Design a protein around this ligand. Structure first.
Ligand code: CLA
Ligand code: CLA
Ligand code: CLA
Ligand code: CLA
Ligand code: CLA
Ligand SMILES: CCCCCC(=O)OC\C(C=C=C1C(C)(C)C[C@H](OC(C)=O)C[C@@]1(C)O)=C/C=C/C(C)=C/C=C/C=C(C)/C=C/C=C(\C)C(=O)C[C@@]12O[C@]1(C)C[C@@H](O)CC2(C)C
Ligand code: A1ECV
Ligand SMILES: CC(=O)O[C@H]1CC(C)(C)C(=C=C/C(C)=C/C=C/C(C)=C/C=C/C=C(C)/C=C/C=C(\C)C(=O)C[C@@]23O[C@]2(C)C[C@@H](O)CC3(C)C)[C@](C)(O)C1
Ligand SMILES: CC(=O)O[C@H]1CC(C)(C)C(=C=C/C(C)=C/C=C/C(C)=C/C=C/C=C(C)/C=C/C=C(\C)C(=O)C[C@@]23O[C@]2(C)C[C@@H](O)CC3(C)C)[C@](C)(O)C1
Ligand code: KC2
Ligand SMILES: CC1=C(C#C/C(C)=C/C=C/C(C)=C/C=C/C=C(C)/C=C/C=C(C)/C=C/[C@@]23O[C@]2(C)C[C@@H](O)CC3(C)C)C(C)(C)C[C@H](O)C1
Lengths: 225, 228, 224
């Protein structure tokens, strides 16, 4: 992608461009992944701030105790919702995300799918398909998938695919601006805060507080921030 | 061949500075031992100093922050937060002795001609590569994994990549020597390094005496502790 | 340069002309850099005395010492303002200027640029550009430079360059007598540079008051 918008061009003040091809592929992969994660996080934050608490948490859904999903949802914004879940829940969610990331980085599965060098190198952003042959052979047939589980993208031309990829890159850049702006607006800051937007965590980057084994860290008070 | 290699390595280390030898130690026969052995000794000692300084800088950060292993071991005697000069002040005396002994064992293995000639190498003064460590393959009882590459993920490296790695190692070693003695100098005299003023507390004991302020004599070994 | 002014010629009462070419290049670069530093000192002292105190020092400048830039600017003459700057500030400023001097003196950079005489002799007044290959390689791409950072001097003929170098030398002379008439006017004296001009420091040559390590020197009272 040379330039989606002709009026901008190649805005590379840091000089990271014109580098090794593996470095450029890793940079493009990081940009696409950060944009997709930011868009998903912004959508989830908007849904949580509006209030979409599910009718769930029955039959021992908290580890013999039964704490309602609305009780976890009655803490404020998404930042307070990420600090009210139990340690096993956050740990298993992070484990599922890590399993998906490791399956995406898998060069054996990518080469079976007909791709290029892994760690999201050639054709970055391509999630490997968890189906068919030589993958997930031990039960777990995976009737769904990651990309297009319902097959809405069954047929698409290469030019249409490239245009959709460029649109996804532009929307990912806009979402990387927007989700960070929303988190900053939660933490005071930004421009036109408004909209209540509750309170904010210590930094949002604390991850899993109130855990056991390595969570005895009173260091989240300072370090400027 | 000796000074020419020395010029080439100095040029690769820094194209601007190049060969900088104001003292001319690369012309002094250190033991009446020609030129090749003298530059081999000098390069080996520079590389060893740089590696030890890089490890010491990382360890100084780890001890100054407070990064203990866990239980039972020598970390249990060290108080929780004493700054890095004082963590080699509270470990037991035999722990210091055995640490220095294991370092000497590693140096002796790195110098023993049986280990060097096992994997086809000679002494750095006698014509070997300076800073090289022979793997383990002479030590009577077998050793599980080597010291340079423990998991052997660097076996596919090109010779050009290895040369650039050596140049980066030497530059990082020099800069880490400078940083580590910035720390040690600020721990002794105030106002030497202006950036580190007020971060590192002052220390009274001697840094160049290993067993000065020697640690206690405690037995941390349980189960069958016949050495009470 | 034989004679920029046709009515002046070559004024060498001390006889330092007609000497070795190394000395000639040394004196020429000394005069050129003296004039450049003189013009910079002229604009700096005029701006400091008029008062253009920057709206800055918003955290991290002197947070421990609690010193705003307005407090440093409210000291009088620019010499007193330089005598009020902290020891890390003066030391780091002198270190930056010294590093620029080291780069201007460096032999390999000058010969890779296409110049000669790393004594700063031949091609007098050159500063090497901080870019491209085999210089400043470790990070720090340095998008700007020292001279023509915005490329205002992109195209110039050799005659235009020679005329502008003559303008450099003559304006450097004019501003050099200007800055010393002005600092002497700050210290009383001079022809007639009253212009308020505040007060004065000891000499402006100390370059390190109230410092530490060797600055226990009360010797700036005398020497006549
Ligand atoms: C980065 C992705 C991400 C992460 C880490 C979370 C994390 C969480 N979500 Mg969530 N969510 C996301 C994306 C995400 N969501 C998206 C894309 C949607 C659809 C728009 C939702 C819709 C959603 C609902 C409807 C609910 C959560 C809830 C929760 C919490 C349990 C937990 C903090 C629950 C909660 O407690 O919210 C307050 C809940 O009820 N999420
Ligand atoms: C772990 C949670 C998770 C994550 C990370 C994703 C991630 C994604 N889903 Mg998805 N999805 C999920 C659970 C999840 N889904 C569940 C539980 C359902 C059933 C309601 C769906 C139903 C679903 C549909 C119907 C579609 C996606 C699509 C997508 C992609 C946009 C993206 C890769 C879209 C996609 O891949 O199309 C391009 C799409 O059309 N998802
Ligand atoms: C003990 C550590 C050590 C050792 C053994 C070496 C060894 C060597 N260096 Mg070296 N170097 C070091 C640390 C060391 N360096 C550090 C910390 C720096 C960064 C400042 C450098 C920067 C450097 C450059 C830029 C170059 C070398 C080069 C060389 C090689 C030839 C020069 C020579 O004869 O030795 C160097 C001289 C000595 C080791 C002198 C010994 C120390 C004296 C006896 C004590 C002085 C202490 C005193 C307090 C220092 C005051 C400092 C200040 C006031 C001046 C040689 C292999 C050259 C090269 O690249 O060849 C491959 C070269 O061009 N060195
Ligand atoms: C420069 C040499 C040096 C010296 C003399 C010491 C000396 C000491 N260290 Mg130490 N340390 C060093 C480097 C050094 N360290 C480095 C480079 C690291 C970072 C890995 C550490 C990390 C470290 C920890 C985490 C702890 C100590 C502790 C101690 C004290 C007890 C002895 C002990 O069990 O050491 C054990 C130290 C080591 C085994 C590391 C040194 C081995 C070399 C230099 C580095 C090897 C790389 C690394 C271990 C690879 C690990 C694999 C990776 C997958 C994790 C003693 C004062 C303990 C203590 O009481 O703290 C107050 C303690 O808990 N050290
Ligand atoms: C017993 C352990 C031991 C042994 C045998 C060696 C052996 C060696 N080291 Mg070494 N080293 C060790 C531990 C050891 N190291 C440790 C723990 C460190 C710190 C991490 C280093 C750091 C180090 C560096 C940085 C370098 C070496 C180098 C060397 C080599 C040459 C040293 C030399 O000629 O100096 C000989 C030194 C002595 C004879 C002095 C020994 C100290 C004496 C015994 C102290 C006693 C004095 C005291 C007053 C007595 C008290 C009692 C009295 C009152 C009666 C050699 C292979 C050099 C090398 O390989 O360069 C090519 C080199 O540059 N070493
Ligand atoms: C039972 C089997 C296991 C027993 C283990 C044991 O007994 O103790 C183990 C133990 C404590 C303990 C115990 C427990 C294990 C906790 C529990 C047990 O409890 C019971 C049973 O009761 C016993 C007890 C109390 O002991 C602690 C172990 C600590 C350890 C092992 C500390 C290493 C430091 C390395 C350093 C400092 C590196 C220096 C730096 C070095 C070596 C170098 O720079 C080398 C190098 O420069 C050279 C020379 C040349 C260069 O070219 C190359 C380089 C640069 C590399
Ligand atoms: C494959 C099937 C499966 C099993 C067998 C388990 C193990 C398990 C038990 C036995 C409990 C209940 C224990 C109890 O209450 O007694 C439990 C829970 C949670 N889990 Mg783990 N888990 C995920 C993370 C998560 C969260 C948020 C919670 C809870 O809230 C709840 C909980 O423990 O509450 C404190 C995700 C999301 C990415 C997915 C998934 O399918 O997405 C792709 C799964 C799937 C599985 N989980 N998980
Ligand atoms: C006065 C003033 O203001 O200045 C201040 C400035 C400043 C900076 C604040 C100060 C400081 C502190 C300093 C200067 C600290 C310097 C510290 C330094 C330089 C520390 C090196 C570590 C190197 C390591 C651990 C090597 C790892 C090596 C590794 C992991 C490997 O070998 C693996 C590998 O290599 C292979 C085998 C081959 C390749 O495949 C590459 C890789 C990596 C995979 C001071 C003192 O205060 C002074
Ligand atoms: C939030 C936070 O914490 O961040 C902090 C960061 C920070 C920076 C601490 C903050 C601050 C305050 C500031 C702005 C501090 C910086 C001040 C600054 C940057 C001051 C420059 C002086 C330059 C001089 C004097 C140049 C002289 C150059 C001279 C005299 C020359 O003639 C050079 C020369 O080359 C010529 C031109 C020609 C050559 O032939 C010859 C030589 C080589 C001699 C803030 C605002 O608080 C924010
Ligand atoms: C704690 C100690 C320590 C540190 C902190 C450290 C740092 C770095 C850095 C980062 C600055 C780099 C980039 C780097 C790279 C290389 N190291 Mg080092 N290294 C350490 C230890 C050893 C030992 C024991 C050996 C060794 C070697 C090599 C070789 C192989 C060259 C070749 O095979 O040609 C390369 C490329 C082996 C060798 O033979 O060196 C002559 C060898 O025996 N290294 N090393
Ligand atoms: C400290 C400070 C500042 C500053 C500063 C600095 C660095 C100021 C530097 C000033 C500088 C660089 C001043 C050079 C003088 C060199 C001279 C005069 C050489 C003369 C040489 C002469 C006059 C030779 C004369 C001859 O006449 C003789 C012998 C016979 C005649 O027939 C012929 C000629 C003409 C050849 C700021 C920036 C202003 C503000 C800040 O806040 C405070």
């Amino acid at each position: 992608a040379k330039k989606l918008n002709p009026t901008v061009g190649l805005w590379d003040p840091l000089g990271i461009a014109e580098t090794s091809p593996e470095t450029i592929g890793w940079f493009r992969h990081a940009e696409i992944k950060h944009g997709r994660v930011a868009m998903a996080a912004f959508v989830g934050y908007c849904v949580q701030s509006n209030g979409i608490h599910f009718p769930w948490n029955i039959q021992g859904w908290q580890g013999t105790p039964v704490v309602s999903f609305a009780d976890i949802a009655a803490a404020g914004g998404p930042a307070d919702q990420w600090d009210a879940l139990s340690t096993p829940a956050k740990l298993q969610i992070l484990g599922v995300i890590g399993f998906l990331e490791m399956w995406s980085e898998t060069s054996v599965v990518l080469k079976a799918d007909g791709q290029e060098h892994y760690v999201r190198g050639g054709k970055p952003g391509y999630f490997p398909k968890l189906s068919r042959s030589d993958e997930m052979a031990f039960p777990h047939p995976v009737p769904l998938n990651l990309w297009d589980p319902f097959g809405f993208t069954s047929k698409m031309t290469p030019e249409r695919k490239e245009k959709a990829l460029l649109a996804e890159v532009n929307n990912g850049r806009l979402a990387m601006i927007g989700i960070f702006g929303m988190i900053s607006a939660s933490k005071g800051l930004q421009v036109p805060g408004l909209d209540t937007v509750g309170i904010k965590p210590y930094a949002g980057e604390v991850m899993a507080p109130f855990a056991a084994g390595d969570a005895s860290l009173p260091f989240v008070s300072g370090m400027l921030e | 061949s000796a000074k020419a290699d020395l010029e080439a390595f100095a040029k690769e280390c820094n194209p601007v500075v190049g060969y900088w030898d104001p003292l001319g130690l690369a012309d002094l026969p250190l033991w009446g031992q020609d030129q090749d052995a003298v530059i081999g000794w000098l390069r080996h000692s520079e590389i060893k100093h740089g590696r030890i300084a890089m490890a010491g800088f990382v360890g100084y950060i780890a001890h100054a922050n407070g990064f203990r292993f866990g239980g039972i071991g020598p970390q249990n005697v060290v108080p929780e937060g004493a700054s890095a000069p004082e963590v080699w002040d509270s470990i037991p005396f035999l722990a210091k002795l055995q640490i220095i002994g294991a370092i000497g064992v590693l140096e002796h293995i790195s110098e023993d001609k049986n280990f060097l000639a096992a994997d086809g190498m000679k002494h750095y003064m006698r014509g070997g590569k300076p800073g090289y460590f022979p793997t383990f393959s002479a030590n009577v009882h077998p050793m599980p994994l080597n010291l340079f590459d423990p998991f052997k993920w660097s076996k596919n490296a090109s010779p050009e990549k290895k040369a650039k790695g050596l140049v980066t190692e030497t530059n990082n070693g020099r800069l880490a020597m400078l940083g580590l003695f910035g720390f040690l100098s600020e721990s002794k005299i105030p106002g030497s390094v202006p950036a580190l003023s007020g971060i590192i507390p002052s220390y009274d004991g001697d840094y160049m005496q290993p067993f000065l302020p020697t640690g206690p004599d405690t037995s941390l070994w349980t189960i069958g502790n016949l050495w009470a």
